[PDB]
Point group: C2
Chain length 885, copies 2
């Protein structure tokens, strides 16, 4: 949406005027005129949005070029910014900088010419929104949206198919056979396969089960390395060996554990099936492979009897439609006729039903809205076979999105098709792109989380993973939606442009690269960098892939020189040996995601960049000394990393009344314990997620800075993580008193701490703690005797525990909702008083005593006894990794 | 041919028995058996070759499988060799190393099985040996072949096309037009193009001429950088510059220099011409482009008036065939009819005639052979349009070719098609693969050179550049011959397999890679080495790329582990930052060519590989401190490098009477002057080409080490090179007396020497020195006055000198034949006395004073009159750089 570009430019310009007079001292007047012009123009574009846009070209034509002048203004302004910073770099003390001052005055001439263009647009019409103001549509206030829990998990109308498939199971023993699930895109084949994968009979029958995603772009070795990843924790040996050895190892592993089931998802071509088939052992067992394909021919090749997936019936369609649109609540009678007509117009395609349900929830719940929806659906679903029917339906749903949401939804298409998107990264990207601007009380990250939740509610986005707490973790757009938004962003809005090379094609030339605004590459990135391409007007660079790629020491400086006006640099997949000096002249940089293996120091020159918000660094080093003055990059909102970052010692300038208090800071992922000192904590009042990695005993020790005591200061802290790297137990560690911890702390993690279970009472005292995950022998002992305290705790996560005996009362864990038991060989059995608690529903048993599993059956049995009685306690489901237990 | 494999196995086994008994001590008996049976198999194969194996099916089978046992015996014996050396590495001092001695003895059980399998078959060979020997053919001795000096430079019946083309040019001035050239493959279009590109009228009209090859698989940036390299020295900067901006610079450079002609060679597809035409400015000047293509459609697109090439007429065919077959000599009358009939049967295709001439040369000069050839060609040329007729003709020529030479043509195909093969590299490959076996007294390299000259004489291999002295420098296979050689070597004899991948295709799997003998990769290789491949029966790896590809720091150890039985490792085009341990365990290594940029120290462990002949290192460093005890690698025959290497100080073992005197050694290309010491020269008695790089002063200084004196010891030296890197003229340098230089010295080169033109008398005193090349101010001064001495000098080459006055008499340069005056911008004129030298044939004057060029034309006119005066004077040719002179 044009408003997004105009607003971003406006915000940048006001920030530039406020923060730095010198940068804009030269052209302050034209800049301010541009700022006022942009404000009024944004008002104009809003008025235009009020009237039908997709219908009238003339309103669109008036809109057209407002952006181009804005884009030119944005460009010219950025060019000026970099030029003036380069002037500073020269450090010329001359009053009249005879060299390059004329050039910067000519840049000021470009700025003035852009001012004249915007003035010309205002001249063509004093506003141009007279006709627009004449007609106003869709007048209404803004209401709230609700965070979604897992809803309508049950699949409407596909249970019979689940039973049919589960009947194909054990059709013939001692054999490997493939079951082809054939259906049109979005018909629910993947959902049906997922259902079959979670079915209790399937889980009980086959000891080992695997989920495998065979995209259209699968990569055999990557596919095999994943399958090997599940079975064995350490994969160092298998990395170095050939794909055929990988297949042989997979075959051995599958043969080890009795019988097995594997689901190959979205097998596009028969050849891929053939190539992948070699991994699975034909070990004379009743093993089965579930295959989800959209092509009939490939399904027939896999097996002459393909299980055709059937359409939903009208009753099923209406049930699904009302469930989706109204969630738990049922449909009001007055809307039932309209909803039934809409569902009957879906012909039984679940995706159509879900998309129209999203459209309905977006529009409202009035009879007129439903009548309009029914009319539009009838209009846009005359035909049946054409896949463009779903595109038209998606268009219908999309047009009703809020403008800011539309920009995020499109910016989702940019991530590779079929690639699961980290939610946190996606949020931080939007904040960098300026899509999301501070509104109301919610902080930007919170607003972005709300945006993603709304999109999930609309059914636009799918959730692939959910954290323990239930929050979304990884999102992937559906393929049809991904294609629709890809086309939209690439053509209609030119939000981003993607270079994907066919074999015969070649990289677009410099002239074409000049037009693109944002760049996303998923083909070979290295071949692109070999071309030495140059674009002055690419501000966003994105490359997402599974395989990590090195940067040849000759191609390193390609990026900063190729693009000098970068904001978003997402090169996480690209491994960098070092950084050229040209990187330290990307002043318009907001986001930096890069991976390195040798980088040990973050250099000082990184400090000079000022607009950066996020920083993500993957390095194999066990230490990452940060020498850049983070205390000066005021906009800094995150410093992510996985090493033991050692923050620089804060030092207030001897002759400054500026306090280096970065009020914007939110995260410090894995800073080193030595840095957990009073000053750094004092400098980050609003910190909201801390984590440490290194010698935790330094925190706990008195001699060092009493770091765990200093942690009391972060009044707002809500996520703590202690990681102990020392593989040597030099002594025992005793936590501090419960009052030292930040009051709001809601999520805590302990890894390799080896704490004494007598301290668990300390964590019990915490009032708000809601997610306690201790892993890698976080707490070491043999007898745990819970002493209550965890009033608010909702989930408990134990892994690699050497605990022999645990004793609990129903009062000890009142709110607990889910329990995870991993590598708990020592523990004999799980206290029954935990079975008493109603909240506790789901628990996972892995690598634990079979007696513990029988007592877990007893726990589920008490919950099932409540079920049989009808007494109301939250329903209970059991997961045990080894079925034998 | 099978004899080649058997002979190589026999030689390697004999060498293993002689040198190292411990490696063979385990299976000495099976080794000696194998040796005997292999000798008998070699004799049997020779006898079968005497007969026509193809004629009889029984024979085909009898020859078949003798090779398989030999290949099987090689694999087992090599595996034992490496395993036993690994045992030595273990250093298990136990009398019975029962653990893992039974593994190496498992390999030994394979060995013994093989020995028994050979004794079988030897028995099967015993039967029928008499039946084979009952028949024989082609009973004749071997005669001498002679060196291939340039001949038949003129092109038969093609001056009509040349004049037509030169007429087509200059049609429309102030405009840029491209003239198509069309015709079937091998029709001579490139020959005509090169003829035109050298015609004096062309060399007079257009100042700027450029010749460019456009393969089937060209790469635009590569050729643009090369085109720029013509006008300016360096290309490394533009390596950081985009293809389109490269094109802009090319256009500027080319437009600055008056008019221009450019020849694009072998254009295949329209898209390529479209993409490439950009660099040429249509700057409103009379400029032309000459493109050669085999397709009519591309030619028509480039211009509606393509120039069809004409077939050679029967008289033209006969004259060409006679010139090729009989060289300068005329045809004997008795063979005239057969020759005319054969030429008539070639239908005027120059390539067919050329290959037929090669075949006739191979057969001999008897009427029976000519009648047989006439019959055969009549047989194989009933059709005209079928391209396979030329394939049949080359097969006919090939059949008569000695198997040593036959092993080439097929190994020649390994180099990427269209690649310019460095002759020296090709010969050292030959030697390393073992295709050239000791037969007589000529040094191996000499035998290779004669093989290559014979290949050229039969016309199978076309030469591209000759060194100054005329010895070949760079050759290639013709396209038709290349496809014929590639198909044949891959299918019939399985000499090697190319891995190059097509679209929607995959790298062959480990099963396929188990049946390969040699790997040639000419396309993406980093992709191949990211597959983590594996093969045990691959002995050779060839990668003749275009760009220098780095090796990712994580993907380095793929080659040593992918192939542990390597001999030839030609990875010159792959930049390695370091070497893995698994590389040092490679023991079957003869040839090792590789590049680098940061490698400063050759590792010590690299000196353990006992079996290496060649070594090539294109390290960018200025210094390459060698620490491998080259003195210990008894088969070392070359140590090529480009930086200034520092050979380890020799130390005769304290307790061994074994002298570390290498007598195979031939070259120490670029050792450091510090390492031109007495001992380093005692240890290389048969050294035959030495070069130095560094501060030449330390040599010419007698206080440090009388090093240019020590050069006196190398009684056989025949190529010296003194390269000075010190850019600071600290002092003047004085050559030692002429009696110090080795007597046979036939080539000398001096760069940055800054010697006083007075010393030139010393170089005059040398009696055999035949080619003197002084580049980048070899001698410093302004007045040179010849005093004689250069009795045998044949080529004089001066580049980048400040010589002003040159004075000489005709008696100072009696034998001179070639004179090159490059970048002599201060010289005034050249002594006209040179006009009197009979041998003086060719002189080239580049970028020099116009007065010198006037004197050059005076010399040219004088020699014209001399030849006109009835004297049997050889033809003279004058090359002057700028057309105005
Ligand atoms: O053909 P090359 O193998 O490349 O070597 C010859 C020359 O030695 P010779 O004249 O005795 O053959 C130099 O020796 P090397 O460097 O190969 O050891 C070489 O020097 P540079 O490659 O460093 O330049 C030179 O190179 P170039 O062809 O570029 O002049 C080249 O000269 P010629 O081929 O004319 O003899
Ligand atoms: O398994 P991981 O991918 O490594 O993620 C877990 C954790 O997952 P859960 O929230 O589901 O327990 C969080 O991952 P995200 O959802 O943020 O992607 C995050 O920890 P927080 O919840 O505290 O943010 C992360 O971070 P870290 O590696 O710093 O602990 C932590 O990793 P671990 O599994 O290694 O603990
Ligand atoms: N019976 C069903 N109930 C709910 N959603 C369904 C059903 N069948 C298909 N779907 C669709 O599947 C989505 C989630 O599964 P998904 O992986 O997208 O499968 P598919 O795209 O094959 O339908 C739902 O949001 C909905 O759009
Ligand atoms: N009169 C001639 N005209 C053309 N080619 C000739 C002639 N005499 C000999 N030849 C040889 O025949 C071949 C002509 O085809 P060639 O130039 O190899 O193929 P292409 O033109 O496709 O590159 C060359 O080897 C050339 O030297």
């Amino acid at each position: 949406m044009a408003n997004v570009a105009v607003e971003f430019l406006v915000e940048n310009l006001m920030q530039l005027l406020r923060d730095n007079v010198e940068l804009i001292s030269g052209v302050k007047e034209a800049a301010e005129s541009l700022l006022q012009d942009l404000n009024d123009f944004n008002a104009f574009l809003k008025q235009a949005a009020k009237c039908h846009i997709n219908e009238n070209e003339v309103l669109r034509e008036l809109v057209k070029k407002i952006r181009t002048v804005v884009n030119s203004a944005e460009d010219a302004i950025d060019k000026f910014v970099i030029e003036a910073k380069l002037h500073k770099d020269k450090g010329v003390t001359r009053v009249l900088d005879l060299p390059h001052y004329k050039r910067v005055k000519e840049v000021a001439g470009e700025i003035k010419a852009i001012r004249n263009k915007v003035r010309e647009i205002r001249q063509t019409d004093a506003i141009g929104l007279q006709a627009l103001q004449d007609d106003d549509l869709s007048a209404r206030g803004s209401e709230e949206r609700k965070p979604p829990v897992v809803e309508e998990d049950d699949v409407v109308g596909f249970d019979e198919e689940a039973d049919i498939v589960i009947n194909r199971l054990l059709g013939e023993s001692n054999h490997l056979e493939v079951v082809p699930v054939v259906g049109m895109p979005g018909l629910g084949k993947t959902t049906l396969a997922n259902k079959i994968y979670k079915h209790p009979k399937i889980g009980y029958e086959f000891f080992t089960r695997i989920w495998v995603y065979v995209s259209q772009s699968y990569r055999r070795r990557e596919l095999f390395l994943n399958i090997i990843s599940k079975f064995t924790r350490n994969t160092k040996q298998y990395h170095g060996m050939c794909e055929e050895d990988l297949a042989d190892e997979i075959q051995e592993f599958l043969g080890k554990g009795g019988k097995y089931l594997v689901v190959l998802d979205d097998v596009w071509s028969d050849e891929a099936w053939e190539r992948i088939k070699i991994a699975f052992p034909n070990n004379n067992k009743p093993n089965r492979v579930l295959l989800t394909t959209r092509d009939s021919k490939v399904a027939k090749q896999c097996n002459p009897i393909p299980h055709d997936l059937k359409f939903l019936t009208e009753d099923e369609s209406w049930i699904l439609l009302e469930k989706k649109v109204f969630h738990k609540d049922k449909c009001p009678p007055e809307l039932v006729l309209s909803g039934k007509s809409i569902a009957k117009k879906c012909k039984g395609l679940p995706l159509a039903i879900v998309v129209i349900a999203g459209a309905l929830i977006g529009k409202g719940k009035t009879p007129r809205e439903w009548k309009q929806v029914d009319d539009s659906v009838s209009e846009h679903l005359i035909n049946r076979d054409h896949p463009e029917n779903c595109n038209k339906l998606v268009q219908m749903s999309y047009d009703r999105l809020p403008y800011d949401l539309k920009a995020c939804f499109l910016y989702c298409s940019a991530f590779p098709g079929g690639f699961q998107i980290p939610a946190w990264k996606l949020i931080r990207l939007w904040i960098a792109e300026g899509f999301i601007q501070y509104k109301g009380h919610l902080s930007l990250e919170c607003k972005g989380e709300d945006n993603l939740n709304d999109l999930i509610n609309r059914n636009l986005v799918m959730v692939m993973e959910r954290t323990s707490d239930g929050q979304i973790k990884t999102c992937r757009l559906h393929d049809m939606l991904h294609e629709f938004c890809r086309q939209e962003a690439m053509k209609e809005e030119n939000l981003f442009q993607e270079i994907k090379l066919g074999s015969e094609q070649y990289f677009p030339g410099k002239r074409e690269l000049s037009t693109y605004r944002r760049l996303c590459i998923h083909s070979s990135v290295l071949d692109f960098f070999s071309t030495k391409p140059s674009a002055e007007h690419v501000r966003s660079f994105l490359s997402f892939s599974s395989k990590k790629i090195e940067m040849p020491s000759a191609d390193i400086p390609t990026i900063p020189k190729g693009f000098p006006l970068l904001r978003v640099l997402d090169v996480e997949s690209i491994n960098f040996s070092r950084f050229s000096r040209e990187f330290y002249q990307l002043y318009h940089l907001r986001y930096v995601a890069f991976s390195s293996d040798s980088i040990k120091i973050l250099p000082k020159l990184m400090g000079e960049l000022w607009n950066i918000q996020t920083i993500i660094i993957n390095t194999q080093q066990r230490t990452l000394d940060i020498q850049a003055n983070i205390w000066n990059m005021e906009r800094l909102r995150h410093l992510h990393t996985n090493s033991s970052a050692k923050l620089p010692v804060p030092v207030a300038p001897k002759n400054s009344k500026v306090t280096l208090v970065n009020q914007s800071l939110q995260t410090l992922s894995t800073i080193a314990p030595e840095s957990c000192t009073e000053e750094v904590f004092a400098r980050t009042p609003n910190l909201k997620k801390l984590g440490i990695r290194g010698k935790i005993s330094v925190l706990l020790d008195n001699k060092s800075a009493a770091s765990l005591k200093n942690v009391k200061r972060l009044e707002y802290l809500e996520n703590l993580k202690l990681i102990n790297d020392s593989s040597i137990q030099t002594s025992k560690l005793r936590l501090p008193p419960a009052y030292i911890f930040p009051t709001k702390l809601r999520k805590l993690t302990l890894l390799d701490t080896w704490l004494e279970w007598k301290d668990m009472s300390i964590l019990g005292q915490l009032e708000h703690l809601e997610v306690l995950k201790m892993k890698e022998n976080g707490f070491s002992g043999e007898s745990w005797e819970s002493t209550g305290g965890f009033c608010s705790l909702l989930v408990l996560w134990i892994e690699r525990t050497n605990l022999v005996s645990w004793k609990a009362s129903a009062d000890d864990f009142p709110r607990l909702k889910h329990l995870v038991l991993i590598c708990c060989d020592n523990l004999k059995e799980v206290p029954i008083a935990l079975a008493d608690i109603r909240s506790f529903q789901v628990m996972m048993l892995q690598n634990s005593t079979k007696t513990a599993a029988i007592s877990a059956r007893q726990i589920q049995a008490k919950k099932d006894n409540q079920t049989q009685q009808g007494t109301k306690n939250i329903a209970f489901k059991l997961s045990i990794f080894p079925p034998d237990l």
